[PDB]
Amino acid sequence: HLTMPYVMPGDGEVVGVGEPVAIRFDENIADRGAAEKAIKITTNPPVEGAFYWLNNREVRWRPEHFWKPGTAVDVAVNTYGVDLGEGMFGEDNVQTHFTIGDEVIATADDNTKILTVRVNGEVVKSMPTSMGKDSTPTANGIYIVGSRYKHIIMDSSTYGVPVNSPNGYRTDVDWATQISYSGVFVHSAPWSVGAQGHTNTSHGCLNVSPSNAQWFYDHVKRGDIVEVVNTVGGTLPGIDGLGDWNIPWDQWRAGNAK
C-alpha cells in the first residue's frame, strides 16, 4: 500500500535549459491532484511553472520558457502521510537540488542538413548531418537531451519494428546521445559521411561524423536542447519522455490532473 517517489534530475546535477523536473512513482497514482499538492518546487531566480502528467506514474514540472542559466532548483516531494489516491501513501519524502548550466541549443535544419550547436547564443559547431530518409523521417520539434553512451546497439524491435523488416535495424554505434524515448539519437555514423550535409539516409537518428559525435557526447549534457525543423516528418509527441516542450504552455499549464 506504499509507493516510493523517484526524482530527476539527480541531486547536485548540472543540467541544460530544457530539463524538466520529473517525479516518478513506483505505483499508479489514483489522485494526481494530491500528488501535485505534495510536491513543492522552489526556483532561484523564481519562475512560474506547472505540472503535466506523462503517464499514470510520472509527472513533469517546467516553466513556460527554457530555464535561465544559473538557476538553482529545489524539489521537495512530501508524500509521507499523503493519500495519493485509493489508500496509496508515500513510503518516504524525497528532496533534490540541481542547477542549470549554459544555454545549449542545437538546431538541425532539414533545408540545410546542418546541425548547428549554439552556446549562450553563439555558434560553436556546425555539423553536417544525415537525418531520417523520407520513408522513415525524423520528427520535427524540440527534443531534450537525455543519456549518452560511448557505444551501444540500437535495435528497432525496442520500438515494435522487427529487425528483419524493411525499416528494421540492429546497429552498433559510437558516441550516441539519446534525444527521444522514441529512439532518436545523435551518433557517430562513418557510413553516412558522404550523405551528411546532402541527403537523409537514416531511420530517424541524427547521423554526424565520428569526431562531431564525440564532441557532442563530450560537450552536450542532460537537459540541453536539440530542435529539428523543416523535415517531412510529424512533430515529436509531447508525452514522448523528452518531448515536453512540444506541448504549448496554455495546455501544459492547464495540466491533466483531471
| Domain residue ranges of the chain, discontinuous segments joined by + | 1-101+244-258, 102-243
C-alpha distances out from residue 248 to 43, 63, 237, 252, 256, Å: 21, 11, 12, 6, 13
Burial of 47 from C-beta contacts in 10 A (0-12 / 13-18 / 19+)? middle
Catalytic residue among 97, 198, 203, 205: 205
Query: Is 97 among the residues known to form the active site?
Result: no
- 140-168 as b/e, with b when 16 or more CB fall inside 10 Å? bbbbbbbebbeebebebeeeebeeeeeee
Rounded to whole angstroms, the Cα distance separating 4 from 178 reads: 26
| Binding-site annotation, residues for substrate | 169, 182-183, 207
Q: Which residues, in sequence order, are bridge partners of residue 211?
A: none
Kind of pairing between the strands at 89-90 and 2-3: parallel
Q: Which residue has the cell 510520472?
A: 58
Q: Which residue has the cell 505534495?
A: 38
Rounded to whole angstroms, the Cα distance separating 38 from 176 reads: 36
Q: Is domain 1-101+244-258 classified as CATH 1.10.357.10?
A: no
Which of the following CATH numbers is that of domain 102-243: 2.60.40.10, 3.40.50.410, 2.40.440.10, 3.40.640.10? 2.40.440.10
Query: Is 187 among the residues known to form the active site?
Result: yes
CB proximity list for 188: less than 8 A, separation 6 or greater = 173, 174, 175, 176, 208, 209, 210, 213, 214
| Binding-site annotation, residues for Ca(2+) | 83, 86-87
For 131, left (φ over 0), alpha (ψ -120 to 50), or beta?
beta
Q: How was this structure determined?
A: X-ray
Q: For 218, how many CA atoms within 13 A lie in the half-sphere containing its CB? A: 8
| Binding-site annotation, residues | 83, 86-87, 169, 182-183, 207
Burial of 243 from C-beta contacts in 10 A (0-12 / 13-18 / 19+)? buried
Chain-centre distance for alpha carbon 7: 15
Catalytic residue among 187, 198, 203, 219: 187
Do residues 186 and 213 lie in contact, with contact meaning Cβ atoms separated by under 8 Å?
A: yes
C-alpha distances out from residue 57 to 82, 83, 139, 180, 212, Å: 16, 15, 26, 19, 37
- Residue 219 C-alpha cell reads as 560537450
- 105-119 as b/e, with b when 16 or more CB fall inside 10 Å? bbbbbbeebbbbbeb
Q: Which residues, in sequence order, are bridge partners of residue 168?
A: none
